[PDB]
Each structure stands twice: as structure tokens, then as C-alpha cells.
Amino acid sequence: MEQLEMTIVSIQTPYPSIVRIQGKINTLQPELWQAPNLAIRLIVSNPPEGQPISRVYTVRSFNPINAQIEIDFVKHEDLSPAMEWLNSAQVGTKIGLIGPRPHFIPNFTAKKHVVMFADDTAVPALYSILKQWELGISADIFIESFEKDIASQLPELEHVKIHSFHKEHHTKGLLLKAAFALEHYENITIWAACERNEARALRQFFLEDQQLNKNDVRIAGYWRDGVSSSELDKLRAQHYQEHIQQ
Ligand SMILES: Cc1cc2nc3c(=O)[nH]c(=O)nc-3n(C[C@H](O)[C@H](O)[C@H](O)COP(=O)(O)OP(=O)(O)OC[C@H]3O[C@@H](n4cnc5c(N)ncnc54)[C@H](O)[C@@H]3O)c2cc1C
Numbered sequence: 066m067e068q069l070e071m072t073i074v075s076i077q078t079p080y081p082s083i084v085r086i087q088g089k090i091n092t093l094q095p096e097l098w099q100a101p102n103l104a105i106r107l108i109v110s111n112p113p114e115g116q117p118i119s120r121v122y123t124v125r126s127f128n129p130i131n132a133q134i135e136i137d138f139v140k141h142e143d144l145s146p147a148m149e150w151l152n153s154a155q156v157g158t159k160i161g162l163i164g165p166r167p168h169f170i171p172n173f174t175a176k177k178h179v180v181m182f183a184d185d186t187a188v189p190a191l192y193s194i195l196k197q198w199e200l201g202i203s204a205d206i207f208i209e210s211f212e213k214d215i216a217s218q219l220p221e222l223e224h225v226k227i228h229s230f231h232k233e234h235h236t237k238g239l240l241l242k243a244a245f246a247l248e249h250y251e252n253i254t255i256w257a258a259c260e261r262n263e264a265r266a267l268r269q270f271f272l273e274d275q276q277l278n279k280n281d282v283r284i285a286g287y288w289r290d291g292v293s294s295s296e297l298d299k300l301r302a303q304h305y306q307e308h309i310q311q
Contacts, residue, residue, distance in 0.1 A: 066164055067092065071107075073158045074133060080212040082185070084138040084151055089131065090162065097165055098127040098134070101197040102190045105134075105164030109146040120147045120294050121287075123189035124165060126196065137189045145293065169283040170194060171204070171256040177281070178253045179204035182240040182267060186287040187258035188215055194256075195220050207243040209259065241266050254281040261289030261297075 075087035092098060103124045110118040125135040138151050150160075168190065171179040179202055183191050188208060203224035208215055209232060216227045230239045240263055247253070255277065257267050264286040271282040289297055 067094065068161070068163045071134070071160050071162050073154060073156050076154070076156060079218065080215065082140045082211050084140060085135060086138070086154070087133055087135045089133050092132055095129045095132065098124065099129065100165070100167055101193045102168040102170055103165035103193070104168050105162050105166070108161035109150040111161065118146045118295065119163070123193060125189040125192055139185045169256060169258070169285055171283065172254040172281055173199040173202050176202065180247065180253055180255050181206040182244065182257035182259060183207070184209040184240065184259040185211060185215070190258055192219055195222065195225070198222055198225070205247070207240055209239045238263060238266065241270070244270055250275055255284060257284040258287050261286035
């Protein structure tokens, strides 16, 4: 991996709750940046007084003929670092970054049906995966979003059906309700990314309840309600140190 610098070249509001930024990056190995579902760590704050603060966002795409990546930010009413950074972020804003990180991709091997679950934070990862989709594999995709028509941005591919549910603010387990209700349960493979607690629920269902092999349930928690990314990191470090001990 590398530590680059990104400079914002474009800013869009594709949906009312999403800010789409494009930036050139000074990569010296663009071969790394072409894989699907790459994520970066943006140094959202770097005061000279104090340790730096980073946050993880998905590379929606990487254009190699101009070294431009794009990132979708889910707006959320929180005085968080990434939110404070996005409020004052103009074209030409330079921001530090570390990456890329390859992240989960569906298991196309053996030709099993793919079933995908996502909330607003994993819609960019979904777009990345769909733009390099293994033609011939079928899928059911369930999206949990605040935007009524979040699927419109994703491509139309033969045999990928994309289902979107609509959340209303300040209130449920929708993605799980979809997992409990699939047409069949045999010869399928799972990919998911959402809030930490809903993702754990999905993992528990496809493993401890439907006996799916562990490499056929690729599930991640992109964020956790009431816990900051920084706190998630300190937790992940302590689990790792405790995992290697046994
Ligand atoms: C691999 C990976 C890829 C990711 N890609 C994206 C992406 O492409 N786009 C994107 O918008 N996010 C993405 N995320 C999630 C993002 O990193 C977190 O949402 C992050 O916590 C937000 O930064 P912050 O400074 O707002 O939040 P923090 O300071 O971490 O959060 C503090 C508070 O905000 C809450 N919070 C954080 N995010 C949300 C949210 N989306 N909705 C509601 N409440 C929230 C937390 O629960 C916490 O209570 C990704 C995460 C991972 C692991």
C-alpha cells in the first residue's frame, strides 16, 4: 500500500443525502487501484496539536488515464470528523490518504447464486463490484437506503435483480427481514456490508442457522451505531491481539 495525496476536482450531490467527490491522486502504482471494492483511509483531520484522525471510504471507481478516484459520502446528522470535513470541502481541497485495501468480493467460484445485502455506506462498494461483475453469475441484491431510488445508479445486468427498501429517519431490521425470506437456501453464497449490529445478525443467520460454509458468507460491518470509527479501530486492535494469543 501507499500514502498518497488527493485533490478534489469535482463535487456532486447525486442524491440529497450523498456527496460524490472526485479527486486526482498522486499514485505511483495505479495497478493497485483497479481491483473491485477497494477502500481507502482518508485523513479527515490532522491538527498540528494532536494525533491524526482517519476514516474509511470506498473507491467508487478509479479512472487510470487521469488518476482520478471517486467517493460517496453518506451524510448523517453527527458532528463527526468526516462530516465536519465534508461541510468545508471545496474543489481543490487537498486531503491525505492511505490505501488501497482490497475488501470482500462475492464468491463466483463453483457457480453459486449470489445474495447481497447493503445499506447506504456499502452502496459504493456494490457499484465497484457490479462494474467488474463476473458475467453469467446471477444475484439478488437487497439495499437498505434513505434514498428511495438508490438503485438507479447501479448498472442493469442480466440476472442481477436489485431490491431497495426505504428507511425513514430516527426509528428497524430491514436487511434481515429479507434474509429470512429468500426463495431457496441451497447452492447460494452471501456478501454483505452494513451497520455492525445488523451485519452480525446476518452472519449468525447464515452460519449458525443455515450451515453455510464460512467462505460463502462474506459479511462486514462498515459502521456501528453509537460507536465512532476510531473506537471501532481500538476494538479491532484489541480483538486481534486477543485472537493471536489463542
Ligand atoms: C471498508 C469500508 C468502506 C466504507 N465505505 C463508505 C463509503 O463508501 N461511504 C460512506 O458514507 N461510508 C463508508 N464507510 C463507513 C464510514 O467509514 C463510517 O460511516 C464512518 O464512521 C463515518 O465517519 P465519521 O467521522 O462520520 O463517523 P464517526 O466519528 O465514526 O462516527 C461517530 C458517530 O456517527 C455515527 N455514524 C457514522 N457513520 C454513520 C452513517 N453512515 N449513518 C448514521 N450514523 C453514522 C456512528 O454511529 C457514531 O455514533 C465504510 C466503512 C468501511 C469499513
